[PDB]
Design a protein around this ligand. Structure first.
Ligand SMILES: CCCCCCCC(=O)OC[C@H](COP(=O)(O)O[C@@H]1[C@H](O)[C@H](O)[C@@H](OP(=O)(O)O)[C@H](OP(=O)(O)O)[C@H]1O)OC(=O)CCCCCCC
Ligand SMILES: CCCCCCCC(=O)OC[C@H](COP(=O)(O)O[C@@H]1[C@H](O)[C@H](O)[C@@H](OP(=O)(O)O)[C@H](OP(=O)(O)O)[C@H]1O)OC(=O)CCCCCCC
Ligand SMILES: *[C@@H]1O[C@H](CO)[C@@H](O[C@@H]2O[C@H](CO)[C@@H](O)[C@H](O)[C@H]2NC(C)=O)[C@H](O)[C@H]1NC(C)=O
Ligand SMILES: *[C@@H]1O[C@H](CO)[C@@H](O[C@@H]2O[C@H](CO)[C@@H](O)[C@H](O)[C@H]2NC(C)=O)[C@H](O)[C@H]1NC(C)=O
Ligand SMILES: CC(C)CCC[C@@H](C)[C@H]1CC[C@H]2[C@@H]3CC=C4C[C@@H](O)CC[C@]4(C)[C@H]3CC[C@]12C
Ligand SMILES: CC(C)CCC[C@@H](C)[C@H]1CC[C@H]2[C@@H]3CC=C4C[C@@H](O)CC[C@]4(C)[C@H]3CC[C@]12C
Lengths: 40, 517, 517, 40
């Protein structure tokens, strides 16, 4: 980025892909729970 | 548009099918000079608040986010919203409550030793989670309970705030250069004048008054009976650009006197290159970002979502009233999804999130409004105007020699014109005007001919109390609670108001389409 | 009123029998706040030109006639005209052509080594001889040949001259204190600033614009539908005094910036105690007055009589049209006799002769005009208003602390208001507006629905050429030929116009009471 | 008057009365002449 930045295990695209995958998993879990409810 | 389908993403799909068939018309309907005049209007009307809020943000956040990031975010979000939105008449830009939240969050990060921009990244990440759940569960259907009461209260309050800030800027200009018997002729000018200068505040007042006078006179001249109708209407459409040009030339032909001008950054670079880059690591820039704040950012994300949701949805309700002759439809699910998602994405780049501002969108709708022989005829509903405004905002950095000759006082008069023209369609403003009129001069309208005079005056005065309460909240450090107090007016309409008024009175005074019950 | 009886002093006796029966009503009809507001208006409207013309006369004639003499003459002649005149609404005061004649006569006396004030005494002696013969032989019956053509041309020209002088005074103020980067903070102020001063011109412009804006807004508020009707009309009548007070307070609370104030003489004394006394000897002060100039004064007396006669009679025609709801009668013979006789008598004391000024009298009539339920209903025709105006003009010297805090820019805005409001009743100004309008928006008037559009436009353009010719003559050293060129419009109407327009067209366009033939 | 003025045989009221009397005589003569005309 700019000047000196702390070096992490994951780069920015990797960590943002992981965060987006976790968000998508949470959204899918919530939608599946909502689909399960209102039917039984 | 506000009906509940019961299907996941049901509102999102219906909004797309409602507007996207008119996508071809959304380009062809813009082939008119009024669209170009609206572009020239809204370009300055969005650029000047953007510059001011960027400067304030840079001052209040140690230049972590400043003018350049705000301009880039405004341009990108405006372009993508005009290309993909369902109500393209909305203007996406920064607002005051967002600045207050940024102040509070920067103070919180400074107190707890947290990286402000990484916290913004995590909040924007939490913002995307909230909007997807709201859109999928048709959470935008709750806006149907916001009747004319809350909409008009919010619009009147926002217009009064805009006018108050416009006048306070001139008051601050007068305070910076007070009228004195003697002046120091040796005053440093760079970066800004460090001492009072003669003829500055008075010339600013003259420029603002002349700009407002010319704008109002050209607005009258549009509906006037002078000149051929085509030429007269063309001149009236370009009334605001003509007034801006006239006052800019007037100030330009006065070389000796100093007046504050527009200030854009030198280039497309971050405000502070020593703090952050264009892409901010979610794990931290200098210090390791703790895990607990990644979950604790949901509550500030909830507050941001509430603010943006209320602003954008109430603005969409105002601009899409049936009395405004909107015949192309609006989307409450698609627009909210686009705005909040783009804000969350731009948060990752260290750029401010935006919302559909009320005054700018209302002015954009009014600048495209075609008036018949008193009666609204049609509205130039198209995507080209907002797209061009966003493109010009993005290109504002490259055109500094043009913007550097435009004084702020001209923009102050333009903002005063916007504020006085944003009160046309509000029935609250009309009923406030009826407080100073004899009852026999009231117009033949449903809320007068079916309601007693003192009942209507009491109903208006109840809204005045709400306006005062909302104004007091803004003058407090807890001004981020303004959306909640604004929401509290909705129970007032549906719980406390029926306890004192009859059903016919509430139908006449609070009507969705101004009907006589 | 203009019929010839054939009896010596026939018109004079008829004028007395027409108006003097209404003398009791001419005092009891003034018991209304509108009369007091009109008094406050006309007091400034007559005092400020009096002060300006007195200063100019003192500077151009080495203070032989100055501010004090002009003020005393104005007071005495106004009191005598209000007490004994047949049209008390006329305001008698100094005028521009009188100043030009005084300049020419002072130049003539300086070239020939004559005493200027003694020459004025002999002119006033010759003035009494002319008016008595004219009144006895009913010479005022020639006024009936001055139709709406000449009246409206003269009124439009005089209003344009008034507005142009009002703007030129502001231009002079701007030139004296230009907008400069630096100023000398130590500049001598007595009697006037010897150098440019900061913020002076801009503050003067702000004061003038604010005064005009407030006057126009209160005038529009009078006809508006706000507030109770009694209070609304009371405030609307006092619109000019309220605007004057507001702008006076605004300038008063700005201590540092300098603005020019009203300056009145210290006491009731002659302007030059080293030149003349209060009574000037007709045979000379320092040197014996030559016998040849005693008989040679007839030609300047003829010129003064022509100027005063044309001004007073055209002003009386304008203010006493039947369309203005003047139901008390006007006397052409008595007013002319009073004005010229008072001028001849005041010539003996070294006081200037006056004339019925058009703008001041029209403003006085309009300030007493009552508007019913758009339509003129009645006029507060009474003698108390002019009497009070003259008394306050005479007492202006003793009320210096009140006048010394009143800026001239406030009076400039008042003058602009008077100029724009004096053009309401002129059909020439109405037909000038129709030149920029499509024919389908023309009003339902006899000169539109019975005459072709291009014929009416050509008739208006012929009048515009006369206005340009009269304007050119004013801007020349031979500006004293203006009454003759003005009179030459009567042969143009009565001879040349029928050669190109039909009888019905001239009856519709030139109507003495706006009738459809 | 003021300062020093030239001496005259007639004073101001006397000379103005004489001038007004001459003017009134001329006016009366003109009126009598006009009365004589339009009759014969
Ligand atoms: C600068 C233009 C050229 C100047 C050269 C001057 C020569 C010149 O300009 O004449 C052409 C044209 C005349 O044509 P015309 O009078 O028929 O034009 C009417 C006019 O445009 C109205 O405004 C229209 O009504 P609206 O507003 O749509 O409701 C009306 O349409 P409609 O409803 O009846 O069907 C039109 O018919 O101009 C004028 O309008 C007269 C005022 C011109 C003012 C003089 C110019 C200062
Ligand atoms: C400060 C003023 C007093 C404040 C106290 C506030 C209390 C207060 O002022 O009410 C009294 C009075 C109500 O009585 P009301 O309406 O009957 O009085 C009518 C009113 O004066 C109209 O202006 C008159 O018509 P116009 O003009 O001649 O054509 C009309 O005469 P007419 O033709 O029917 O015979 C009058 O009847 O006022 C108002 O008009 C309401 C607007 C008040 C707005 C006040 C906003 C401050
Ligand atoms: C850009 O950011 C840096 C730090 O990231 C700022 O440097 C700080 O400035 C403040 C103001 O006095 C002080 O805390 C220190 O002087 C600096 N702190 C550190 C840790 O270096 C810099 O001021 C910012 N740039 C601007 C224009 O504000
Ligand atoms: C009052 O009148 C006297 C004489 O009429 C003026 O004195 C003259 O001033 C002019 C201007 O310089 C010159 O002709 C002479 O200096 C004076 N001449 C005589 C004969 O005295 C005096 O200036 C007048 N007062 C004012 C204020 O102008
Ligand atoms: C609402 C959105 C942002 C998703 C919810 C965030 C939570 C559930 C998840 C998303 C991604 C996750 C991170 C992914 C990777 C790492 C790196 C590891 O060395 C420490 C934990 C840490 C830092 C995780 C903490 C928990 C985390 C932040
Ligand atoms: C039209 C009015 C002014 C009257 C007409 C003026 C002529 C006819 C009269 C009126 C007053 C007269 C003057 C009155 C007094 C004197 C002083 C005397 O020692 C010589 C004659 C002389 C100078 C007279 C000359 C003629 C005179 C000027």
């Amino acid at each position: 980025g700019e000047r000196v930045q702390l070096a992490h295990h994951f780069s920015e695209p990797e960590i943002t892909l992981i965060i987006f995958g976790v968000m998508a998993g949470v959204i899918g879990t919530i939608l599946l729970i909502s689909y399960g409810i209102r039917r039984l | 548009p506000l009906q509940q389908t019961g299907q996941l993403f049901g509102g999102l799909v219906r909004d797309i099918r409602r507007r996207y068939p008119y996508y071809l018309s959304d380009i062809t309907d813009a082939f008119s000079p009024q669209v170009l005049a609206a572009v020239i209007f809204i370009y300055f009307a969005a650029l000047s608040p953007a510059i001011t809020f960027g400067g304030l943000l840079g001052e209040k956040t140690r230049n972590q986010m400043g003018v350049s990031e705000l301009l880039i975010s405004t341009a990108v979000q405006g372009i993508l919203f005009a290309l993909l939105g369902a109500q393209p008449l909305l203007v996406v830009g920064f607002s005051g409550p967002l600045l207050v939240f940024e102040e509070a969050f920067f103070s919180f990060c400074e107190t707890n030793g947290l990286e402000y921009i990484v916290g913004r990244v995590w909040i924007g990440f939490w913002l995307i989670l909230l909007v997807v759940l709201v859109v999928a569960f048709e959470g935008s259907f709750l806006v149907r309970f916001i009747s004319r009461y809350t909409q008009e209260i919010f619009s009147f309050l926002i217009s009064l705030i805009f006018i108050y800030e416009t006048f306070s800027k001139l008051i601050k200009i007068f305070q910076d250069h007070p009228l004195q018997k003697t002046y120091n002729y040796n005053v440093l000018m760079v970066p800004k004048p460090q001492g009072p200068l003669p003829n500055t505040a008075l010339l600013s007042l003259v420029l603002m008054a002349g700009t407002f006078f010319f704008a109002m006179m050209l607005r009258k001249f549009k509906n006037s009976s002078y000149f051929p109708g085509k030429l007269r209407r063309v001149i009236g459409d370009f009334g605001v650009p003509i007034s801006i040009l006239i006052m800019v030339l007037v100030d330009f032909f006065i070389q000796d006197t100093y007046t504050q001008k527009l200030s854009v950054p030198d280039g497309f670079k971050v405000s502070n290159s020593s703090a952050r880059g264009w892409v901010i690591h979610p794990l931290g820039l200098r210090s390791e970002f703790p895990i607990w704040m990644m979950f604790a950012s949901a509550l500030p994300a909830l507050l941001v979502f509430i603010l943006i949701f209320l602003e954008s949805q109430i603005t969409t309700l105002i601009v899409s009233k049936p009395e405004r002759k909107m015949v192309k439809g609006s989307g409450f699910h698609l627009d909210l999804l686009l705005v909040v998602g783009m804000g969350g994405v731009a948060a990752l780049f260290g750029m401010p999130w935006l919302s559909a501002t009320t005054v700018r969108s209302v002015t954009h709708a009014n600048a495209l409004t075609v008036m018949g022989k008193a009666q609204i005829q049609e509205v130039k509903e198209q995507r080209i105007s907002g797209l061009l405004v966003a493109v010009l905002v993005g290109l504002s950095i490259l055109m500094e020699p043009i913007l550097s000759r435009i004084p702020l006082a001209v923009l102050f008069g333009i903002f005063l014109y916007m504020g006085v023209t944003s009160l046309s369609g509000i029935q609250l403003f009309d009923r406030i005007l009826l407080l100073f009129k004899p009852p026999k001069y009231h117009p033949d309208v449903p809320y007068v001919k079916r309601v007693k005079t003192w009942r209507m005056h009491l109903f208006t005065g109840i809204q005045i109390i709400c306006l005062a309460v909302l104004w007091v909240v803004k003058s407090t450090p807890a001004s981020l609670a303004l959306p909640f107090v604004l929401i509290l007016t909705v129970p007032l309409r549906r719980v406390l108001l029926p306890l004192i008024f009859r059903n016919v009175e509430l139908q006449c005074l609070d009507a969705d389409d101004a009907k006589a019950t």
